[PDB]
């Protein structure tokens, strides 16, 4: 088969010129017209770093070298956590690669660089249309000397549901083979059985196991008894007994006050004198720099930081602030400030390309109300964008109050992905329906809760500390199936060879083990990603402005496909609509006229919504959210029981089962499969 | 300067202590340390404020800083621990970057310690929410149009908060906006050429006008000092 990469790229550029951005843009901001300036890099291999120790001496040798290091070690979140929080994890492989050689040379003493796991795996395929594995491989070639770190969920890997154990093990194996070094293993509820599986999978792969305790509450507040200092110490003892190489405290919201830092970290150090202590926080409160200095003074060996232009607010504390504040003390990081400035200047320019995703569109600074609401950095940005998309943007203060009430109703569980989303969906549901906590708990048998809340209460994410809230769980679930113990333990092993064969039959002989694991964790996303890249080619070759907005008429630019293969492209014109509903886009490619036929849905777009449900008529079932009808479970003339499934709506990437509020006969169904509904659109009538 | 840096001899701890003795002898009711740029590191805070407290046990000590470096909250906590009686803060939505440290951050970090401010956090939130809405009316003047966060290069350039915003707007009005990095470097060179004087209004503007003049004319420090009889310097 002849490769057609240049034509596929021109087809993408022509598609963006006719139809607009293929990635959903949350705010009316434009990318910077200027590409970021890459700082000068020395000619040669980078200096030896902590990865050379890990490769020579293994995970235990690496952990001893970290503990024995004189001074404070840093870990860079800019590659993943910093943007996940600020630009919603939209940062592309293109921009990461440009600065990677500078990082390798000037930051060779970093403990690790966090660059992959969390939301980056799904987001790369779903929204950036790039392979997360290729990003890992190409960054590993460019940065040979710094350990790569990922955020791993213990029994779910990087996915949103539980997987069979053999998928989690095979994911950690293939991640290590592809150059992942450190696995930060956490659970969204600190549910030890999920963490132990992820630790065993990462350790069996030959990775550095970093067991991460998610922090919530306040250990310095004697009134907060559920998540006390004793809770954290007891969980640390179980994770150390399970053979963690490094112990992490993951403060996903920025709740660690300097006094709580001092108390928790000194207690851990006194208990575990030889174990490396890694502290992660967010600067959401504007106190994260002070919190990390207090951790370092209390005997933390490593702290998470971001590049200064990618730090603060819902991100990590500033790298330059920590380096400057520790300078000339026993905690000196030995990082030259000039190198931090050049790194920050690149990221300031690069962040300008992502203005369309920047959390500063909605939040101008850190906010201390995080000590009340306990909303994690990445959840705050997402919950605001969701509230605005649902017409609740003016009520976001009510949504934050309802988030506290929803956390309590759910039982004050730790709030990190996906538990932070479950609390968020419940909070939006309460505000949308005008419900207080007491009304939502009283009516729990009558209300149709968000799917994420139902699946949590069923046990699909593990068991929360202190157990599930009763009688609230029993009222919501009724007769719905309950998962006891670890949800992955009852799943049959996935046949990865059968899946590989299915993928080869669908996509041809170029299927890799990484493709099989991507399909195993994210089947619909991976299928869409392969179909999209089959149509549009290697979009990672485009600069971020051209990827998001396409070229302007008469704009000229270069695209490097491979070393020594540059495309000189100029956009010339877009035609009027032809009789086939297509526009012809004209380009110059390497001094030659090209034309591509594209499709303008915007040019010809119209629709009509009949349906309305009277709020006072119990038999009229309205759509509980804007969404697409996936499935219709009933027909006209069918008898239905109270709580019986009627239809399935798919909105905001969540199947919601619409259930009957009464017993009766379905008089009429007003909806069809694949129909798009607005809120309160009449689904069906019951008599 | 930096009192914790033994290489910076001009503005040493002894300079600050000697000036404090003259101002106390002159009958000051309160002694203020005005860090107009956000240069006070937590170690320098501890050293300066403890030395002042040990010398003047009965005198109120007031510490003012800017959060330009992103370390201003940590600097004010270090001053308070070293025996400062008062610190400057701003409402949270009006804090950080070239402004003062966050009020809500200081109130939260001192809560339940001997340094508790007794300010209820809910009242700080309501105050910040008003100012978040009010700041939206001034979007046409907001420093975030040009500076998205604090910047640690302030430890090198020593540009005060209000001068940074003004110097950027002036550089953009003169067509030097793309050269603002050269203007910041020339600000260090201009400070040295002028003799490393304290930089606050109007001295911070004088250094700024010289820095813009040097960049506009393509002059290094050595060329500007050599040609000082031939050049028409800014009036300031
Ligand atoms: O639009 C759909 C969701 C896109 C991913 C959101 C990520 S999942 C990791 C992190 N935790 C959350 O609760 N949200 C973000
Ligand atoms: O446009 C003309 C100047 C407007 C006032 C600028 C003020 S004066 C106080 C402060 N210090 C400076 O150097 N600039 C500002």
From Swiss-Prot, chain A:
Cofactor binding summary note: Binds 1 Mn(2+) ion per subunit.
Predominant subcellular localization, coarse grouping: mitochondrion
Outcome of swapping residue 119 to T: In PC deficiency; mild
Maturation and modification: Acetylation of Lys-257 might play a role in catalytic activity regulation.
Keyword Membrane: no
Outcome recorded upon mutating residue 92 to L: In PC deficiency
Location of this chain's protein in the cell: Mitochondrion matrix
Biological or metabolic pathway of the protein: Carbohydrate biosynthesis; gluconeogenesis
Positions bearing N6-acetyllysine: 98, 170, 226, 257, 401, 478, 501, 570, 599, 633
Function, as annotated: Pyruvate carboxylase catalyzes a 2-step reaction, involving the ATP-dependent carboxylation of the covalently attached biotin in the first step and the transfer of the carboxyl group to pyruvate in the second. Catalyzes in a tissue specific manner, the initial reactions of glucose (liver, kidney) and lipid (adipose tissue, liver, brain) synthesis from pyruvate.
Disease: Pyruvate carboxylase deficiency: Leads to lactic acidosis, intellectual disability and death. It occurs in three forms: mild or type A, severe neonatal or type B, and a very mild lacticacidemia.
Protein name: Pyruvate carboxylase, mitochondrial
Gene giving rise to this polypeptide: PC
Residues included from the entire protein: 492 to 1178 of 1178
């Amino acid at each position: 088969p002849a490769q057609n990469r240049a034509q596929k790229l021109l087809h993408y550029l022509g598609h963006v010129m006719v139809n607009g951005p293929t990635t959903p843009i949350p705010v009316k901001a434009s990318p910077s017209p200027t590409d970021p300036v890459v700082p000068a890099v020395p000619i040669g291999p980078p200096p030896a770093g902590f990865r050379d120790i890990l490769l020579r001496e293994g995970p235990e040798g690496f952990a001893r070298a970290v503990r024995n290091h004189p001074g404070l070690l840093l870990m860079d979140t800019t590659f993943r956590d910093a943007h996940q929080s600020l630009l919603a994890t939209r940062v592309r492989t293109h921009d990461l690669k440009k600065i990677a050689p500078y990082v390798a040379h000037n930051f060779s003493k970093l403990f690790s660089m966090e660059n992959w796991g969390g939301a980056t795996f799904d987001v790369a395929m779903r929204f950036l249309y790039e392979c997360p594995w290729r990003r890992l491989q190409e960054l590993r070639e460019l940065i040979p000397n710094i350990p790569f770190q990922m955020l791993l969920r213990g029994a779910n890997a990087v996915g949103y549901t539980n997987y069979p154990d053999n998928v989690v093990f095979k994911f950690c194996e293939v991640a290590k083979e592809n150059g992942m070094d450190v696995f930060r293993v956490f659970d969204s509820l600190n549910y030890l059985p999920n963490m132990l599986l992820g630790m065993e999978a990462a350790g069996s792969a030959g990775g550095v196991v970093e067991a991460a305790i998610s922090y919530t509450g306040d250990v310095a507040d004697p009134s907060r008894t559920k998540y006390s200092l004793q809770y954290y110490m007891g969980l640390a003892e179980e994770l150390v007994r399970a053979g963690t190489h490094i112990l992490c405290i993951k403060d996903m919201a920025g709740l660690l006050k300097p006094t709580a830092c001092t108390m928790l970290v000194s207690s851990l150090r006194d208990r575990f004198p030889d174990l490396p202590l890694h502290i992660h926080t967010h600067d959401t409160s504007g106190a994260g720099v002070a919190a990390m200095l207090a951790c370092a003074q209390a005997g933390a060996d490593v702290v998470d930081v971001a590049a200064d232009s990618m730090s603060g607010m819902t991100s990590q504390p500033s790298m330059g602030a920590l380096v400057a504040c520790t300078r000339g003390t026993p905690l000196d990081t030995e990082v030259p400030m000039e190198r931090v400035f050049d790194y920050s200047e690149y990221w300031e320019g690069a962040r300008g390309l992502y203005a369309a995703f920047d959390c500063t569109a909605t939040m101008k600074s850190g906010n201390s109300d995080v000590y009340e609401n306990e909303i994690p950095g990445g959840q705050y940005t997402n919950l605001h964008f969701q509230a605005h998309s649902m017409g609740l943007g003016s009520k976001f203060k009510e949504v934050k109050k309802a988030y506290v009430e929803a956390n309590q109703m759910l039982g004050d569980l730790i709030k990190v992905t996906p538990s932070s989303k479950i609390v968020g969906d419940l909070a939006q549901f309460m505000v949308q329906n005008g419900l207080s906590r007491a009304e939502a708990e009283a009516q729990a048998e009558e209300l149709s809760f968000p799917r994420s809340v139902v699946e949590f209460l069923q046990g699909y994410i593990g068991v929360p500390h202190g157990g599930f809230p009763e009688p609230f769980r029993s009222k919501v679930l009724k007769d719905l199936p309950r998962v006891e113990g670890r949800p992955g333990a009852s799943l049959p092993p996935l046949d990865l060879q059968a899946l590989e064969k299915e993928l080869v039959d669908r996509h041809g002989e170029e299927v890799t083990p990484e493709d099989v694991l991507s399909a195993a964790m994210y089947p619909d996303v991976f299928a869409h990603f392969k179909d999209f890249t089959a149509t549009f080619g290697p979009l990672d070759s485009l600069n971020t402005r051209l990827f998001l907005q396409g070229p302007k008429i008469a704009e000229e630019f270069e695209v490097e496909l491979e070393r020594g293969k540059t495309l000189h492209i100029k956009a010339l014109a877009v035609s009027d609509l032809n009789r086939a509903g297509q526009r012809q886009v004209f380009f110059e490619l390497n001094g030659q006229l090209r034309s591509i036929l594209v499709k303008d849905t915007q040019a010809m777009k119209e629709m009509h919504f009949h349906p309305k449900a009277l709020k006072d008529v119990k038999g009229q079932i309205g759509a509980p959210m804007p969404g697409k009808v996936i499935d219709i479970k009933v027909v006209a003339g069918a008898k239905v029981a109270k709580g019986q499934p009627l239809c399935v709506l798919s909105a905001m990437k969540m199947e919601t089962v619409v259930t009957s509020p009464m017993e009766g006969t379905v008089r009429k169904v007003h909806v069809t499969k694949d129909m798009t509904l607005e809120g309160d659109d009449l689904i069906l009538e019951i008599e």
